[PDB]
Amino acid sequence: TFRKSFDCYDFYDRAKVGEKCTQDDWDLMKIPMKAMELKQKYGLDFKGEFIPTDKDMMEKLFKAGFEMLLECGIYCTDTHRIVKYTEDEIWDAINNVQKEFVLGTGRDAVNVRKRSVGDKAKPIVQGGPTGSPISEDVFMPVHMSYALEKEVDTIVNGVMTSVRGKSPIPKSPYEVLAAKTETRLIKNACAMAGRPGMGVKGPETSLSAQGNISADCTGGMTCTDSHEVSQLNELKIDLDAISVIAHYKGNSDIIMDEQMPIFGGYAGGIEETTIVDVATHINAVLMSSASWHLDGPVHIRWGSTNTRETLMIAGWACATISEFTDILSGNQYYPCAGPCTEMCLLEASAQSITDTASGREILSGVASAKGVVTDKTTGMEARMMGEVARATAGVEISEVNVILDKLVSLYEKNYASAPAGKTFQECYDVKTVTPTEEYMQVYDGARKKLEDLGLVF
Template sequence: MSDFPGGMRESDSHEVSQLCELKIDVGALVVGAYYAVSGVCVMVEQMPIFGGYSGGLEETAIVDVATTLNSFVMMQATWHLDGPVHVRWGITTTREALAVAGHAARAIEENTHLLLGNQYYTLAGPCTVMCLLETAAQAITDTVSGREVLSGVAAGKGVTTDLFTAMEARFMGEVAHAVAGMDLHEVNILLDKLVAMYEKNYKTAPAGKTFDQCYDPVKLVPTDEYVQIYNEAVKILSDLGLTYWD
């Protein structure tokens, strides 16, 4: 057992974050130096903002690549946790954020051996089809662009207490398995159809339910309602051509 707070092991990911865009504060530098001399697994996070200081798709993708490389050069990261976020909606599942994440990861994966992750912030909350479809779109993007780590899901923009469950994470994993090895052209067609299903509902996205409202907190199993919603999302993706659940 290590001497780190909470009994963390050296192999556990120890987080330190850059700031937007391509900035960092003294506190993070101190933490990063501490991790470096301690020889622990270092996870450096940064979420470039589409529509912010970076600008549009191309510019934000360039910034995303730069911040990723900076994590390894300046912070001696073991792996980088990405998360391009939309300035208007505050989520990672918009069409633009997915495009940034996909292009940045693909560029890095084809030219390096660096370990990449991406974090998930959906607009809709748990126990809703929209939340699962948003999750699916990002899982598809991350998988085909070569990311090694999927980190989610922070539903409802990740700003409300207890607004997440294991069902979203399970769906994320299943969808990743479903698209692994698929042709990139086919995936892009599928993604275009999938994102179109939920992006028109941004202004009326359902808040969803908290953990204790859609899970049995004692048995730790989802409610029948959530299982039905989950199956509905599975059917939508099956109809789009994914065969994982057959």
């Protein structure tokens, strides 16, 4: 049996005396070799499906992901050593995951419960700039564009480009100011939208451990909000995250562990990256004591989470995690196209279909324009994400796979030429926080194309 249930403290202890190893040995050898080995060992082949129905192939994928975590362990960048788990420790973690939890407070609180593959229930819609840079003078208006949408249940925080006119430089007092201010302003935006108790997800503007740890505060982030801790790539972590985890646990905060496996990255292709994804979903409840895990498979070249390959990785990982565990999870949205464009909406729609049908509990989006362009994220994208989620709920997986193949085909040849789109200021009346007729027309066009594919809103 195991000594004690594994936690961040045990991780630190082991990371100081684990097997010494260079990061290159890890990224260029250990990880890719194991993924390659397990893929062949279990004969994994997704056969072009976005969401699996073959229980035997799914069981093999689960065993592969479990075995990968068990045989590889986790690389700690700070100590250049490997932390290894035992089989019993892993099962203790998987066998005791958080069943459900509440986000938000008052009338605006929402319950997060497990959804199965093809579930008739609709997932929780977490809408927001999704970590994208947002100008200080429109921070509240931008977030209000999400709170004003009935489709949105919780908010995923954007990043303040400035606070009191200064960049929130890591380890500067401005970073601490931003970490606290970020959610204080967002919750005030929610209140102005008539939903003071909406739960949020962050912190996002802060990057350092001290910055992230300062985010819990009066009027700001509290225990009913999702607290983010990020895993590295792949099966890797830094000590900063470990201390942040200790902090979240010590405050009885809902913990959201995140990991975004890279397709074409250190693991390799589709099946390889999916084995890693399953392994990091499991690591989430082991190393980070997560309440839920946020996935986000991203294309090494396009940097999007909605390419054919990344949707397949997410679909298989989630369907498999749903079949063999009660681990709660979500997926994050990174379209190539920017706001107010048909492609952006179709891109997010493809992922919403995939995430809803594969069993995700929470949809966290949308980081339009790959989430790196100032002010290019608006509530309209979250509205589509949510409406598409409802349309997908209950639909037969066989039909979903057909729809996905057709939909993805509508934009996968245009990644390099994805439209830049427009900013919040350009497609919304900034004062009343209402989308322009221009955006509404674009929205209708996307909706029509989705309906032609068989989706019923």
